[PDB]
Ligand binder design. Structure first.
Ligand code: Y2E
Ligand code: NAG
Ligand code: NAG
Ligand code: NAG
Ligand code: NAG
Ligand code: NAG
Ligand code: NAG
Length: 335
């Protein structure tokens, strides 16, 4: 309804680029913030149409211009060339704050699906701290749902609408290029992955009850969405998830069809230099990988899925606003 401002712990001394950008762009966070509670109020919310998501999207686009300059950017006819130094890159949390005369309502119902009426409501200055993590397929380093796994969708009956699975328990994923030098891999403990898809399958069955629930790899598209793609320490990782989204939830029980060894699923990754951009329709070209070990230890906190008797779910992504939705779903700007 209005233009929000960002607050952060950034550090004028960190040369990490999120810190630099936030020192320029954000104000410091208020050390004790005021919440109010209002359980009588009940208001309505719609995570799929939230101006906060657009404002954040704009900020993160700007932060990626400042911070991860491509050596070459092609959009339309034009190629744009500029210096592309290697940088220190580690996302920091950002708070979105309502300006004077404006407030942010937070939905306190622990099981709110992002849509409709919410009974217990609060007013706040600012959202919680949201790390702006760019990825497809898996949502990384988010905040977990406090009670059950939540299924969010603009319209579950419309198979073209992205599904966000909000996990109540995180799944560790460790991705590393060790010190071919594009080659990398991710490890996930099969026990957890196995549990969580059983539990996701149970919820998905609640919404599609007759059907058997299967998980299968991404059918097609650009490599950024057919693999789990993300940025680790500046480098763009593309990680095959054929062994991850590979399973059947038949009859109260999940079977994992993907292959594992020593109870560990291992994803083969490549570090790439030609990137299909998430900011606009275009290509960006970056320099070859920095040397040594590149490792990111992350928590999977959510999934992005697309639906195709049987209902069958494949990993999705591509529109980074959904990532911001998955964190901003409980907030609305008012007055
Ligand atoms: C929701 N499913 C549909 C879908 C599928 C795929 C994509 C979209 C949408 N896009 C979209 O919505 O753009 C927003 C609006 C705009 F600008 F495009 F208008 C993208 C269009 N960009 C393009 N074709 N070059 C495309 N996504 C990526 O390329 C993408 O994520 N790359 C990527 C790079 C680096 C990392 Cl680390 C990463 F994690 C990811
Ligand atoms: C979310 O809950 C609302 C009711 O509050 C319901 O109308 C809608 O179908 C639900 N959506 C999903 C994806 O569960
Ligand atoms: C998480 O949610 C699932 C399904 O919604 C449920 O089975 C489980 O008990 C919940 N709590 C956890 C895993 O702590
Ligand atoms: C969402 O699903 C379908 C789209 O195929 C259509 O009925 C309408 O857009 C929505 N329906 C419901 C029940 O919300
Ligand atoms: C992932 O690996 C499988 C087999 O290892 C392969 O068939 C599939 O095409 C790969 N997917 C991508 C997007 O590279
Ligand atoms: C599941 O994994 C096995 C081996 O890891 C592979 O042969 C199979 O194609 C995968 N399933 C799908 C649907 O791709
Ligand atoms: C997730 O957070 C951890 C701890 O801050 C960090 O080491 C890791 O690299 C993050 N992952 C991504 C993809 O940003």
């Amino acid at each position: 309804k209005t233009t929000l401002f960002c607050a952060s712990d950034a550090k004028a001394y960190e040369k990490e680029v999120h810190n630099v950008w936030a020192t320029h762009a954000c104000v410091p966070t208020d050390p004790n913030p005021q919440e109010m509670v209002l359980a009588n109020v009940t208001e309505n919310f719609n995570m799929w149409k939230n101006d906060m998501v657009e404002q954040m999207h704009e900020d993160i686009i700007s932060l990626w211009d400042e911070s991860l300059k491509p050596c070459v950017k092609l959009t339309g006819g034009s190629a744009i060339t500029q210096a592309c130094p290697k940088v220190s890159f580690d996302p920091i949390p950002l708070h979105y704050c309502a300006p004077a005369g404006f407030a942010i309502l937070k939905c306190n119902n622990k099981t709110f699906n992002g849509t409709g009426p919410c009974r217990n409501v609060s007013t706040v200055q600012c959202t919680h701290g949201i790390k702006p993590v760019v990825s497809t397929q898996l949502l990384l380093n988010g905040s977990l749902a406090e009670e059950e796994i939540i299924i969010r969708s603009e319209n579950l009956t419309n198979n073209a609408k992205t599904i966000i699975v909000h996990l109540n328990e995180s799944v560790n994923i460790v991705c590393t290029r060790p010190n071919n030098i594009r080659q990398a891999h991710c490890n996930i403990n099969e026990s957890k992955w196995n549990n969580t898809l059983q539990k996701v399958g149970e919820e998905l069955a609640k919404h599609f009850p007759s059907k058997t629930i299967k998980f299968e790899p991404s059918s097609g598209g650009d490599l950024e969405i057919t693999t789990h793609s993300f940025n680790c320490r500046g480098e763009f990782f593309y990680c095959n998830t054929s062994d991850l989204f590979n399973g059947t939830y038949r009859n109260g029980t999940y079977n994992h069809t993907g292959r594992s060894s020593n109870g560990t699923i291992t994803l083969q990754c490549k570090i790439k230099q030609i990137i299909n951009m998430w900011q606009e329709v275009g290509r960006a070209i970056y320099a070859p990988p920095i040397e040594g070990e590149i490792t990111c230890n992350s928590n999977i906190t959510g999934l992005l899925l697309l639906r195709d008797d049987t209902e069958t779910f494949r990993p999705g992504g591509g529109d980074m606003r959904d990532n911001w939705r998955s964190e901003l779903y409980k907030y609305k700007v008012v007055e």
